[PDB]
Design a protein around this ligand. Structure first.
Ligand SMILES: Nc1ncnc2c1ncn2[C@@H]1O[C@H](COP(=O)(O)OP(=O)(O)O)[C@@H](O)[C@H]1O
Ligand code: BEF
Ligand SMILES: [Zn+2]
Lengths: 252, 365, 781, 64
DNA sequence: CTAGTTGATCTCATATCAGGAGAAGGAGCAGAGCGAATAC
């Protein structure tokens, strides 16, 4: 077995499968858990982020670390096309987990609210869609979830979208986003994501705009003056240092 | 005391005993200095003082006129009477002088080569002490009431800043990131203080009559909210769980960092268990303060009993932290005292007040 | 930068801790004695003690306790160092080879914290589930043992009571239960908690807090048949078990407070109790069919003033003392016809607190000889030390000696002494001051429970008999003594600085300097001088008397009228406690400003502050090594050498040398115990060590430094404590590495390693050259 | 003409109160926040703007 | 039962002076009236 800093053990057979960067990601995820802070697994598409999350959760439940003993009831919000993908990966990698889908397809065949209640009181993994999180925000946030992993969490990029406001109602500190492209149009998206995972680091949206978005963006235009380019460089370096501990982005 | 020396020589008592007993005796014999003077350079009241944590030689003082004076407290002359001469000065002619009152000045911990100063001109300036030039400036949308660097952090170098905004700013002196803020207060944050014990624990006191302890690494707001009654008057947390019945305008962790002393505008000081914020119900009587800005007060170190020196009108009230018993009033200022800073090496005190004076209190005999 | 060589001439002898158990073997009954840095392992034979090992810890052993985890064949030893190095050690004997393997180690120093008043406390759960340390106020550190660590990871539990007097683990409790006495403004109370390692926090104790005696100072955890605890205070002994509350107030323990205890039986039916006056009592627990019936205390007898004591077997008790010689005594079943059942079997020499010492070339040889004021109230004595191994004579004074000086012309020692009288006043025992050949009392016209009576003893320097004993004024403490001839007259005088001590004040306001002449077997009072404070220190300065009244260092001239006349004063001191001299220069050791290089400019007639150290070191002693090197001892067990640097910055003395001796140096003195190194400064400490400081040359010091680093790479310390950390200058507000000082013990350990280890040391001259160098270094002591 | 003024020392808006002691021909302007106080002579034609004026002038003159 | 097709509906995302009159509030002064407070 692999023994990390304080009390976290991930099983040896599970650990051996993971690559070097994947177990580095598990290390980073548990450092975030110790800090009680969120993060973005920014590893590009295909590098393996479902596996890193599954391994980290398996080691968290396995380690019996100290409300919740080990792993509590977690909710995984992902696009509709990959819900059963998450189910398959969980079953193959850590079969002990109970992994239910909150969706019309689903497996429950009763009232959904009963399913959320069962997973909350059984410390299972509830995989749901972003549409359901928007729709069932009344029920989804009454149960004190432990982990709120958002797969392809760049869907939260619009700070004013109903899905974003819904996903930002979870009380837990352990907020994780899996997205190999956590910036798609501008820095407002980065602010929205970092407001989700760690509300404070990048300040209020007006402040983030004035301090980072206008300097960094305006220095990228073709007609940028050299002084303005250097100002954009300074702001970009500041932002990179600011977001370094909570963004883990490995390339291919 | 010859008993103390004899016990130390004979090994009956640990030298710790003599050291702390004599420190306490010196603090109790605090009096207006017979042979010491401090050079007068501030045109306005001194709002803040800070003796450097290492070697305790140099003292910073920020005045209401915006100048920052750097004094040498050592008696480099051969006489028994000396004046604490001013080594350096951010005067009115300095290109980077604060345009308004300097409200907090703090030496960089772990090294005397840098200090910081925050002003009501909405700036936290970081100064190189050698060249005496601003190494950095952090601008804020609203006036700064207080700031504090962690006296313990070998890892982080965050400056916690409390402005009239309801947000506690955390300015990273490592690559400059002032974007981090803490939400949960509702009015001006009149005092901020890092825990001397825990690296990432910050106590913030705001005009909403609340004191909050934050683990700045954490993503889930404040750790503890201090409550006068500890639960006797319990209500859903929207307006209850107040630390004081007024503005909480001063914070000070005790020397060990296991307790927190909060002074508020309800004419009350309170002592709180720093681990769960429980009120220890130490009385302290009535502690007169009506300051509309942060109130700077300090605690003693290296003594048998811990003392707290609180500005009390135009005086310094010395209290015993864990019993609340009133030791004395140091009475030598002509206007309200704004700050007092304690030299722990020799149990000395330096108080700055609105009368443009820095008065030194030394143990008698 | 300075170059200094410190070496231990005499190892520490005061015992600060003794524990018994099965450490070396499952069958052996071991006695582990902690002298300050030295751990001595003896095997308790049928007669006496057989030393099996003596290891030198890189640390002052503050805690020493034996514990047997489940499945362990023999006891493991937990040692905590004053600098908070914790180690669990095991004894592994491989034939001739003996090894103390470090089973676990770590450092438990909190970065910040008020060190507790009553000192470091270390306890172990009786079932060995954890180690509880009280190092700081308001905290209780816990080192779990069930979780088998090799790093001794610990966690603090916050303790709501901030002034804890004593704490123990209770017996027969399903959970680790601590019972402790604490002081709050309401009084002293005994409270209980149940520590939870899983939740890492206290829980409500088996029985609630109970208000105990005002001076309740000791907690004794009674074993399983009774359970509960016994609280010993100044006036009463109480026993609590939660609903059983027994209490006694034996009048025989009222006279002195009980400071140590030990459990005689495995079931705790009998305990030993030592008081500060040396009395040894037996506290007996009478059982009833089990619960506890009644408590009895009976005075077994008198021993040395016991810091600690341990019952070995067969009525043999090791009384380990810090103030006097340690003892191995026998508890007879029947009295000795004097009301005492205690009989001393053996005495282990202890240079007690070496408050003062003088080097004398007695017998007119070329050999030095240390005469030391050793010990305390009942164990006070003079010790005469020579190289013969070190031969140590003992002259019991039966009163505390304070200062000593040699008057060669008169062939006598002047010794300041102090005895306790209880009532007008009555002596508790016949002391050396009262057993003088002739005696006198001061009749001074200047001034007009238990008390200290101070005397000047004139002691013959051949037979060491008290030729004379001059008693001082009532409530007068003699602080300083100097034998010198002043001015221009030929007579040699004993000049004694005194202070008037009354309970109504914290600092003496009155005192006098008395000049005696010892001639014709009589001590005539030649002169007096009323001064306005305690004369802490005096020295002869170019035929004048340099004294230090409370904060003023002033110079007196001896006139033709045979009286003292002030010539100059210096006032820039908190309290000038220590004075030294070389030429026109004076070195003033201050209580907390730590040094002041003063100069008496004779062309004008006043002092001049040449330089000062502005670091706040609290002093215990001070000395002048060279024209520009100044040795000083801080109360935090550190040595530091200041140097006159090379403007106003010239007034700053530079601390060019730093070192953590681990001993409280009480006195320096130039001299050597023997017939390459420059100078020789012997020093005496509280735990009895005598050390020696010499100045080295630059290249030689560099080479030695290199050897020290090599040995640190090679020699393995007992607790895996790094030597640099152990010798790092340490104070509650400062920590620096050692500089300008060579640890002579470590260098001299270069002889006690095998040749392959020497070659490992000397990988980069040959080993034989360094053997020659270390031999020459050993020659100086 | 406003009666509450921004303090030149602490820059707190409307934190300065002006007291016209006409019987003694003296105007006293005091900041509530930083407790800075200034006293100037006044006439019957004087107003709080004139007292704040004298305060600003005294500050600038003293800061030369 | 039970999956596949059909419509509605929601979210989200893509850039660049020549009035006047009266009623309600607050202000400052004026005095009346009663409690305490020196004081003859
Ligand atoms: N350590 C591994 N061993 C074997 N297969 C892996 C490992 N990590 C990832 N994979 C495979 O790589 C594919 C991509 O991983 P996934 O996490 O689903 O995508 P992304 O990380 O881009 O969200 C998956 O089909 C998964 O089975
Ligand atoms: F491949 Be994606 F980032 F899940
Ligand atoms: Zn102002």
């Amino acid at each position: 077995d692999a023994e990390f800093d304080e009390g976290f053990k991930v099983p040896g057979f599970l650990f051996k499968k993971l690559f070097k960067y994947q177990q580095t990601g598990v290390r980073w995820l548990w450092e975030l858990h110790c800090q009680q802070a969120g993060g973005i697994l920014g590893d590009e598409m295909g590098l393996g982020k479902t596996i890193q999350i599954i391994a980290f959760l398996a080691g968290l439940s396995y380690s019996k670390i100290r409300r919740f003993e080990g792993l509590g009831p977690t909710v995984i919000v992902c696009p509709t096309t990959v819900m059963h993908q998450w189910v398959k990966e969980f079953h193959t990698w850590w079969p002990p987990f109970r992994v239910a889908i909150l969706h019309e397809t689903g497996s429950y065949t009763h009232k959904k609210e009963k399913l959320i209640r069962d997973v909350a009181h059984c410390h299972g993994i509830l995989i749901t869609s972003y549409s359901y999180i928007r729709l069932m925000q009344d029920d989804i946030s009454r149960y004190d979830w432990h982990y709120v992993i958002l797969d392809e969490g760049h869907k939260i990029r619009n700070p004013n979208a109903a899905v974003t406001l819904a996903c930002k109602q979870f009380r837990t500190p352990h907020r994780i986003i899996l997205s190999g492209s956590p910036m798609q149009n501008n820095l407002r998206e980065l602010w929205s994501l970092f407001d989700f995972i760690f509300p404070g680091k990048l300040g209020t949206l007006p402040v983030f705009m004035e301090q980072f978005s206008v300097p960094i963006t305006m220095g990228g235009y073709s007609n940028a003056s050299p002084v303005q380019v250097k100002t954009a460089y300074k702001c970009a370096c500041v932002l990179r240092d600011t977001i370094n501990p909570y963004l883990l982005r490995r390339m291919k | 005391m010859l008993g103390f020396l004899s016990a130390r020589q004979t090994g009956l008592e640990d030298p710790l005993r003599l050291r702390r007993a004599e420190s306490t005796r010196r603090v109790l014999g605090l009096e207006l200095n017979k042979d010491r003077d401090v050079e007068r350079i501030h045109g306005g009241g001194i709002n803040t003082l800070d003796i450097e944590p290492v070697e305790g030689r140099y003292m910073l003082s920020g005045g209401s006129d915006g100048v920052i004076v750097l004094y040498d407290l050592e008696n480099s002359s051969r006489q028994s009477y000396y004046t604490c001469k001013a080594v350096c000065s951010i005067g009115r002619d300095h290109p980077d002088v604060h345009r308004y009152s300097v409200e907090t000045v703090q030496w960089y911990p772990h090294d005397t080569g840098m200090f910081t100063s925050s002003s009501f001109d909405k700036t936290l300036k970081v100064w190189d002490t050698n060249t005496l030039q601003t190494a950095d400036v952090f601008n804020f949308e609203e006036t700064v009431y207080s700031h504090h660097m962690s006296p313990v952090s070998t890892k982080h170098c965050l400056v916690a800043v409390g402005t009239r905004g309801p947000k506690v700013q955390l300015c990273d002196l490592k690559s400059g990131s002032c974007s981090h803020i803490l939400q949960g207060h509702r009015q001006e944050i009149l005092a901020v203080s890092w825990s001397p014990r825990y690296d990432y624990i910050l106590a913030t006191a705001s005009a909403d009559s609340r004191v909050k302890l934050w683990d700045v690494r954490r993503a889930s707001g404040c750790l503890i909210t201090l409550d006068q009654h500890n639960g006797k008057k319990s209500q859903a947390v929207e307006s209850a769980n107040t630390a004081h019945n007024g503005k909480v305008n001063g914070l000070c962790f005790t020397s060990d960092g296991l307790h927190l002393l909060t002074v508020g505008t309800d004419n009350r000081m309170r002592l709180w268990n720093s681990s769960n914020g429980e009120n220890t119900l130490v009385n302290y009587g009535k502690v007169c303060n009506n300051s509309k800005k942060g109130l700077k007060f300090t605690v003693s170190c290296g003594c048998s009993s811990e003392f707290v020196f609180v500005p009390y009108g135009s005086t310094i009230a010395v209290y015993t932290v864990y019993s609340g018993e009133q030791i004395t009033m140091l009475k030598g200022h002509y206007k309200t005292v704004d700050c007092c800073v304690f030299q722990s090496n020799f149990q000395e005190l330096y108080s700055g007040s609105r009368d443009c004076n820095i008065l030194a209190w030394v143990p008698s005999l | 930068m300075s170059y200094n060589y410190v070496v231990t001439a005499q190892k520490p002898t005061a015992v600060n801790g003794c524990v018994t158990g099965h450490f070396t073997s499952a069958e052996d009954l071991n006695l582990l004695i902690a002298k300050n840095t030295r751990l001595e392992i003896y095997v308790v034979t049928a007669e006496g003690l057989r030393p099996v090992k003596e290891v030198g810890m890189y640390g002052k052993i503050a805690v020493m306790e034996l514990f047997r985890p489940k499945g362990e064949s023999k006891d493991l030893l937990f040692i905590l160092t004053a600098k908070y190095n914790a180690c669990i050690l095991e004894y592994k004997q491989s034939g001739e080879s003996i090894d103390i393997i470090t089973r676990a180690h770590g450092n438990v120093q909190d970065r910040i914290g008020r060190p507790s008043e009553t000192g470091i406390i270390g306890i172990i759960d009786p079932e060995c589930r954890m180690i509880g340390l009280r190092l700081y106020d308001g905290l209780f550190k816990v080192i779990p043992l069930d979780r088998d660590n090799k790093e001794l990871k610990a966690f603090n539990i916050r303790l709501e009571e901030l002034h804890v007097i004593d704490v123990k683990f209770l017996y027969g409790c399903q959970a680790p239960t601590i019972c402790f006495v604490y002081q709050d403004p309401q009084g002293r109370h005994v409270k209980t908690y149940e520590v939870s390692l899983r939740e890492k926090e206290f829980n409500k104790g088996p029985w609630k807090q109970e208000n105990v005696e005002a001076e309740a100072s000791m907690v004794i955890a009674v074993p399983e048949p009774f359970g509960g605890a016994i609280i010993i205070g100044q006036e009463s002994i109480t026993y609590h078990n939660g609903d059983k509350y027994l209490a006694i107030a034996p009048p025989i323990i009222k006279q002195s407070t009980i400071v140590c205890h030990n459990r005689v039986d495995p079931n705790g039916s009998r305990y030993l109790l030592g008081d500060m006056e040396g009395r040894l009592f037996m506290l007996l627990l009478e059982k009833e069919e089990v619960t506890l019936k009644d408590l009895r205390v009976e005075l077994l007898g008198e021993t040395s003033i016991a810091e600690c004591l341990t019952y070995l077997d067969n009525g043999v008790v090791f009384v380990g003392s810090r103030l006097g010689d340690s003892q191995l005594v026998k508890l007879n079943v029947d009295s000795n016809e004097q009301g005492s059942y205690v009989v001393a079997m053996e005495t282990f020499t202890n240079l007690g607190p070496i408050v003062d010492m003088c080097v004398v070339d007695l017998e007119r040889q070329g050999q030095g000889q240390l005469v030391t004021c050793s010990g305390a109230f009942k164990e006070g004595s003079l010790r005469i030390i020579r190289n013969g191994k070190l031969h140590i004579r003992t002259v019991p004074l039966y009163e505390s000696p304070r200062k000593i000086c040699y008057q060669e012309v008169s062939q006598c020692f002047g010794v300041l002494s102090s005895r306790i009288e209880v009532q007008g006043t009555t002596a508790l025992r016949p002391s050396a001051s009262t057993q003088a050949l002739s005696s006198s009392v001061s009749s001074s016209k200047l001034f007009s429970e238990e008390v200290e009576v101070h005397n000047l003893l004139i002691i013959d320097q051949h037979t060491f008999e008290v030729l004379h004993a001059h008693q001082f004024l009532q409530n007068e403490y003699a602080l300083s003594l100097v034998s010198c001839k002043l001015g221009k007259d030929p007579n040699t005088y004993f000049i004694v600085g005194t202070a008037m001590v009354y309970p109504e004040e914290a600092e003496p306001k009155q005192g006098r300097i008395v000049v005696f002449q010892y001639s014709d077997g009589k001590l005539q009072t030649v002169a007096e001088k009323e001064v306005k404070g305690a004369v802490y220190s005096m020295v002869e300065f170019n035929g004048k008397l340099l004294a230090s009244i409370n904060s003023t260092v002033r110079l007196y001239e001896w006139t033709t009228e045979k009286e003292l006349r002030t010539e100059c004063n210096h006032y820039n001191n908190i309290m000038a406690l220590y004075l030294k001299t070389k030429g026109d220069f004076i070195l003033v050791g201050d209580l907390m400003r730590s040094v002041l290089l003063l100069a008496y400019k004779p062309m004008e007639g006043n002092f001049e502050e040449i330089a000062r150290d502005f670091n706040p070191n609290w002093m215990s002693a001070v000395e002048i090594l060279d024209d520009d090197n100044f040795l000083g001892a801080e109360n935090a067990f550190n040595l530091f050498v200041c140097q006159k640097d090379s403007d106003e910055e010239r007034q700053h003395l530079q601390e060019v040398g730093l070192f953590h001796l681990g001993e409280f140096v009480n006195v320096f003195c130039h001299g050597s115990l023997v017939m390459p190194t420059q100078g020789s400064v012997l020093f005496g400490t509280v735990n009895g060590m005598i050390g020696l400081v010499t100045s080295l040359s630059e290249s030689w010091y560099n080479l030695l430094l290199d050897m020290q680093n090599r040995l640190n790479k090679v020699i393995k310390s007992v607790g895996k404590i790094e030597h640099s950390f152990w010798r790092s200058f340490h104070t509650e507000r400062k920590t620096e590495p050692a500089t300008g000082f060579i640890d002579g013990d470590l260098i001299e350990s270069f002889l006690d390693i095998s040749r392959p280890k020497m070659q490992e040391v000397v990988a980069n001259a040959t080993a034989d050259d360094l053997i020659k160098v270390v031999e020459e270094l050993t020659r100086i002591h | 003409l406003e009666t509450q003024f921004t303090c030149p020392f602490c820059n707190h808006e409307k934190s300065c109160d002006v007291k016209m002691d006409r019987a003694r021909n003296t105007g006293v302007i005091s900041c509530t926040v930083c407790l800075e106080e200034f006293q100037t002579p006044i006439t019957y034609l004087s107003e709080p703007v004139d007292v704040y004026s004298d305060w600003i002038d005294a500050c600038e003159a003293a800061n030369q």
